[PDB]
Amino acid sequence: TVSIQMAGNLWKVHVKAGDQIEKGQEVAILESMKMEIPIVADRSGIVKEVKKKEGDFVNEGDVLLELSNSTQ
């Protein structure tokens, strides 16, 4: 699974089900602390599903997405 690491609102998201990501690739952006901060893939994989959308509330450990390689 991949998850947000801080409280905020999920400024934008760049994945969809069936997309592919690689460790350290950008995946979303998080608005908090009166800044915007990138969110990067904890691991590579095909995206199985996305659990969030643009502007949704997010938190530390709150899920962003699920993979066709999430350990498994």
Q: Which CATH number belongs to the domain containing residue 47 in this structure?
A: 2.40.50.100
Structure determined by:
NMR
Tally the domains of the chain.
Answer: 1
Distance between CA atoms of 36 and 12, rounded to whole angstroms? 10
Range of the domain at 9: 1-72
71: left (phi over 0), alpha (psi -120 to 50) or beta: left
Distance between CA atoms of 30 and 17, rounded to whole angstroms? 20
Residue 27 CA to its chain's centroid (Å): 5
